[PDB]
Amino acid sequence: MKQNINIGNVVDDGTGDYLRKGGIKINENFDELYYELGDGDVPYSAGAWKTYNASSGQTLTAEWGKSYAINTSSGR
Amino acid sequence: VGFGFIAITLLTMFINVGLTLKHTETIINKYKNYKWDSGLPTEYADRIA
Structure with missing residues (x-):
């Protein structure tokens, strides 16, 4: 969220x-991000593939x- | 023989402090340290067991 160090350079x-x-x-x-969205996330874009697998x-x-199942077989 | 002559006391401590202060030994030890510049090492030594 933009407040972080530059952490030095190779000149x-x-x-x-x-x-x-x-x-x-x-x-x-890291401690910015993994805690900036930290207790939560984005479900929609990664919440798609899996359930193309079984109904479990x-x-x-x-x-x-x-x-999201994005395909047949029982929809889970 | 014609004067009063009374006696009084004074005391002088002469505390001698200021002995020692010998600075003992001064000690310094060099470091190889690590900055993000770094760059190519020449081989390696030790590094784990």
């Missing part, structure tokens, strides 16, 4: 990096959504 051999410090940053970057209960529980 020549050079110096200024943080040279392995950036984890505490690198974490926040196919748990979507307690986040997103899963089974």
